[PDB]
Symmetry: C2
Subunit: 228 residues, 2 copies
């Protein structure tokens, strides 16, 4: 549909990991035929896990029908997995969206909404055991695609799959041009973004420090699965 | 606590800032500031609204200052108040950093004279008039000055900063906890690797910005020369 706008919506919730959202937001908002939304129960300030304040732009009720929905992750996912209004919104939008996507533990929210049953998916590495009880077929890849579902565990996975989205919504030339326009050329100085590549001591520390969060998130996950 | 400040200005390219912000805010014993003339809402180039936390007047002496880029850089390069603030902080800061065309703001402030630096590829020709030695690399370091052209270069140099402020184990722990593991599906993030037509088309899209930014740059340079 040429210059018909593509409506792209990010769920913006308390204690979101903001970079999960702000990366794909800035990539996709650089496209002339995209209209991005930051969605919560009402417009207004929403505090990210770091204390950085974002502003939601639309309520659930006023959000237009989305062509792309994206659920970020972060600490705030635990509450969101048992928020019936938010889960109903997500389900409603996902029913007609061209693409359904998530970053990090945002896929656990998709799971809680019933959208991963029998689907290949990933999540943040520390929480990957929580995919199967939500019906997912867990896959360890940076971005996992199953039909129109795209999930990625890493904090910037949405930047990467945003380029895939741009290519399919528009054309490869449009995705490459956004990459060049923004000069997205990552080159980390360390190779510790996976438990399979970080030093053993670093993995040990991260695993130990995440244990209480995983324990609670499992309890939440089992209730969410029971409701499905 | 380590005092870390990002300049948050109208029409900023928000990801330039929000990437390194989320990395550095994950560290122990840091305090991260979003700095503008007064606290309150600041609208990014995409329309996304951010909230400045700290005025120029109230900002503590920073250990790290970071100037992001975006459309709003043009105005900043001819904003004496902003340029003075940046100089005052840079005089004391352990690290002075920028992303994308934020290095042109450092340049306009007189902070790149004789310094190796980079900027967004489409604006790279504007570094030498500001006294810099242009270097075509993703992150360029000259002493305690770190500049990177690409939109996420601050994520990468933030991990370097984390390692030097704390230690490499701490930086790696943050990388693992955030699961920062980029894997782009295209290889067009450099004018050396993008298709020719894509280079041409991106340049055409930037051309009026560059034209204006060139004019601004030559004015900023001439103001420095009179100093």
């Amino acid at each position: 549909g040429s210059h018909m706008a593509v409506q792209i919506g990010f769920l913006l919730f308390p204690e979101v990991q903001q970079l999960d959202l702000t990366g794909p937001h800035d990539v996709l908002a650089s496209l002339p035929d995209v209209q991005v939304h930051l969605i919560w129960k009402e417009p207004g300030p929403v505090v990210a896990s770091s204390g950085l304040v974002l502003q939601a732009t639309t309520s659930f009720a006023d959000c237009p029908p989305l062509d792309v929905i994206c659920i970020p992750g972060g600490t705030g996912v635990g509450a969101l997995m048992e928020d019936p209004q938010a889960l109903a919104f997500i389900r409603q939008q996902a029913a007609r969206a061209r693409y359904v996507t998530s970053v990090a533990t945002g896929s656990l929210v998709l799971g809680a909404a019933g959208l991963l049953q029998g689907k290949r998916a990933t999540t943040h590495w520390a929480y990957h055991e929580l995919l199967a009880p939500l019906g997912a077929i867990p896959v360890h890849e940076r971005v996992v695609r199953d039909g129109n579902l795209l999930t990625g565990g890493g904090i910037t996975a949405g930047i990467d799959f945003a380029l895939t989205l741009a290519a399919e919504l528009f054309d490869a030339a449009t995705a490459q041009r956004v990459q060049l326009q923004l000069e997205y050329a990552p080159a980390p100085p360390f190779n510790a973004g996976s438990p399979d590549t970080a030093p053993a001591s670093v993995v040990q520390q991260a695993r130990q420090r995440a244990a209480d969060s995983l324990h609670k998130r499992r309890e939440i996950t089992l209730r969410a699965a029971a409701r499905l």
